[PDB]
Structures are given as structure tokens and as C-alpha cells.
Ligand binder design. Structure first.
Ligand SMILES: Cc1cc2nc3c(=O)[nH]c(=O)nc-3n(C[C@H](O)[C@H](O)[C@H](O)COP(=O)(O)OP(=O)(O)OC[C@H]3O[C@@H](n4cnc5c(N)ncnc54)[C@H](O)[C@@H]3O)c2cc1C
Length: 329
């Protein structure tokens, strides 16, 4: 089954892009790597108030994503979750075939890359967990030390930032536990020796295996000794994950895209160098690019208009205004 447009990425930009595809009557598919939509907003700032979106004085990340899902839903596009698009090829008739890393074949006339700077992966940490506990008592760093006062804190990680975070948290937290899969740590050794001798509880060599929680938040983590294979359940009031991020374009590297600074070069029409392949949102590279949600909200529709022109040169330059759009009023 051949789609007119397949959008790679279901972040905020992919969602609005899908809506605009619907306005221009294109048969539309969105493909997202995570188990839920909303991209960096959903994973990294769902609880924060965004104030730099045109026309919206203040909105919580999560609420923006609900509103963008509502927009995306308008014309009922097909949403594909839990798939990393890694393969690209062209059929004889110009149809593009996208391959998911599990062999899944998707057929399309055009592609819009709304993939940001890559799949949103945290090293050795489950996407499902990242999505489920976002905005709760899951952190990827220490914003302010005072919020951790009196709390039982676990830090998973073995780098310098992990060891330093433990040392400045030890005076403030009810308790600090550091979980790491190797007995050796990063940073200056004085910081390690200090942590190791302080009341910080140092759990090595242990692997973080699982997060145990409810609707309110994470309540323990199950860890496994990397040698004996013995399981422990460690109590959690706050979990800080410091494993590092794995955010990159991966096998799209080998599609022959013109790439600059980890992003995909876009002309003013949001065209890449690959015919039928357009780009929008944080994925787009050009000099004056606005690396905001507001930027993506212009690039998306621009990309749809170019896709539409590419499928039919005699199409109107853009969709009708929403206020006089025949399917909306
Ligand atoms: C802490 C923080 C605060 C921020 N605050 C603001 C703010 O106040 N205002 C603002 O405008 N912006 C802010 N941003 C930036 C904002 O997050 C981005 O501009 C926005 O997320 C871009 O959306 P996007 O859809 O282009 O990319 P993303 O949100 O990165 O979404 C892209 C999606 O594509 C998926 N994906 C990637 N590759 C593939 C593939 N190959 N196959 C399938 N799926 C794939 C990814 O998993 C991801 O979910 C902030 C960012 C951070 C980290």
C-alpha cells in the first residue's frame, strides 16, 4: 500500500506536519521509534512551561503534545510506533521503500524527515521507562540540589558527573546510592575515594535491570550483580540516570544525504539532496534555522507543500486557510 507521504519522527514537528498533510489531502503515515509520540518534549520536558510558541502564552510540554496529537488526528493518518527507520531504496517506478530495522517494509511516494538529531536513546536504559516516568522522579541530571533534600536518591552511572553528583548530594539527601556496572569510576580518583569512604552507598559491579513503580512514580529499581547474578531491589525516592545519550542519525548516515553538524541540509523548500525526500524540525540544517518548536511549525508545512508540488506540479502553492478550508468549517 503506497502512501503519498511518510513522516519519519512523531515528535512535535512530525505531528503538526501530519496534520498539514491531511489538509492537503495526502495519504499520510508517521513512523516513530519511541512507544509514544511527542519526542523531546515528552521525554525531556513534559512538565515544563513552554512560552516561546507563537500564540501560546504558556503551555506544559505534555499539554502541547496532547494538543498536537489532536491536530495530527484530524485527518486520521496512520501512526506507526516502536520502529526505527534504517533502510532506504527506490523502486523502478520511483516509489520509495523504507525499511524498519526489523525488516518492516513501508511504501511511499515522498518522505519527510522529522527525526530531529536522531532516535532518542539513553545508553542502557529502556525507552519504555524513559517514556513512562518522564516528568516524575526520573532525572538525567541535577537541576537544583535543594529539591533532593531528605530524599532517597539513586544515581546510575560511573562517570565524573555521576561521582561528583553523589558527593554534593551526600550532605543533603536522606541517602545516596550509586549503581555502576564496573568497579572502576571516571573523574579524578580523589572524588571516587571520597564518595567510596562517605556514607554514599556504592553498588558495584551492578547492572540496572528494571524500574518498579506506579502512577505516582518509580519506587525501586532492580539491579543485578554482574558476576554472581544476584538480584537486589533498591528503594527509590529519586532516580538520576547518567548513562549518556545516544542521539544520532545512525544508518541514515548511509543513505547519501547531505549532512552537516549531525543535521540534514535543507534548501528553502525544505528539500534534501534526495529526490522526494524533505526535512523539518530539529533535523533541518541551514544557517539561520530556528532550533525551536516554532521553527519546525513552519518547516513542516513547507515540506508538505514541496512534497505536494513534487507529486503534482499543478497543485496550489499551499493549503487553503483553515478558516475557509472546506474540510474544517
Ligand atoms: C531541556 C529542553 C528544553 C527545551 N525547551 C524548549 C522551549 O522552551 N521551546 C522550544 O521551542 N523548544 C525547546 N526545546 C527544543 C525542542 O525539544 C525541539 O525543538 C523539538 O523537540 C523538535 O521537535 P522535532 O519533532 O523536530 O524533533 P524531536 O522532538 O527530537 O522528535 C524527533 C523524533 O523522531 C524520532 N526518530 C528519530 N529518528 C527516527 C527514525 N530513524 N525512525 C523512527 N523514528 C525516529 C525520535 O525518537 C524522536 O521522537 C527544548 C529541548 C530540550 C532538550
Amino acid at each position: 500500500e503506497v502512501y503519498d507521504v511518510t513522516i519519519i519522527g512523531g515528535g512535535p514537528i512530525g505531528l503538526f506536519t501530519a496534520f498539514y498533510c491531511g489538509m492537503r489531502e495526502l495519504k499520510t503515515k508517521v513512523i516513530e521509534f519511541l512507544p509514544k509520540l511527542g519526542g523531546k518534549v515528552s521525554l525531556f520536558f513534559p512538565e515544563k512551561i513552554i512560552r516561546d510558541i507563537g500564540g501560546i502564552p504558556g503551555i506544559a510540554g505534555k499539554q502541547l503534545i496532547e494538543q498536537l496529537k489532536e491536530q495530527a488526528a484530524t485527518f486520521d493518518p496512520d501512526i506507526v510506533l516502536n520502529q526505527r527507520v534504517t533502510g532506504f531504496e527506490r523502486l523502478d517506478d520511483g516509489t520509495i521503500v523504507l525499511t524498519g530495522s526489523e525488516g518492516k517494509k513501508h511504501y511511499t511516494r515522498t518522505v519527510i524527515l522529522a527525526c530531529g538529531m536522531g532516535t532518542l536513546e539513553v545508553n542502557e536504559f529502556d525507552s519504555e521507562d524513559a517514556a513512562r516516568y518522564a516528568g516524575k522522579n526520573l532525572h538525567y541530571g541535577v537541576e537544583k540540589l535543594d529539591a533532593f533534600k531528605g530524599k532517597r536518591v539513586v544515581i546510575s552511572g560511573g562517570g565524573d558527573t555521576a561521582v561528583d553528583w553523589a558527593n554534593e548530594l551526600e550532605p543533603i539527601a536522606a541517602s545516596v546510592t550509586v549503581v555502576h556496572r564496573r568497579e572502576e569510576f571516571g573523574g579524578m580518583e580523589s572524588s571516587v575515594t571520597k564518595m567510596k569512604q562517605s556514607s554514599v552507598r556504592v553498588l558495584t559491579p551492578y547492572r540496572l535491570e528494571q524500574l518498579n513503580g506506579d502512577e505516582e512514580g518509580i519506587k525501586s529499581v532492580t539491579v543485578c550483580h554482574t558476576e554472581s547474578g544476584q538480584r537486589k531491589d533498591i528503594e527509590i525516592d529519586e532516580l538520576i540516570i547518567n548513562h549518556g545519550f545516544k542521539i544520532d542519525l545512525g544508518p541514515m548516515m548511509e543513505w547519501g544525504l547531505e549532512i552537516e553538524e549531525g543535521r540534514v541540509k535543507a534548501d528553502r523548500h525544505m528539500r534534501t539532496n534526495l529526490p522526494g525526500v524533505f526535512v523539518a524540525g530539529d533535523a533541518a540544517f541551514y544557517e539561520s534555522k530556528l532550533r525551536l518548536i516554532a521553527g519546525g511549525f513552519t518547516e513542516g508545512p513547507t515540506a508538505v507543500n514541496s512534497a505536494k508540488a513534487y507529486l503534482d506540479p499543478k497543485a496550489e502553492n499551499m493549503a487553503m486557510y483553515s478558516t475557509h478550508h472546506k474540510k474544517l468549517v
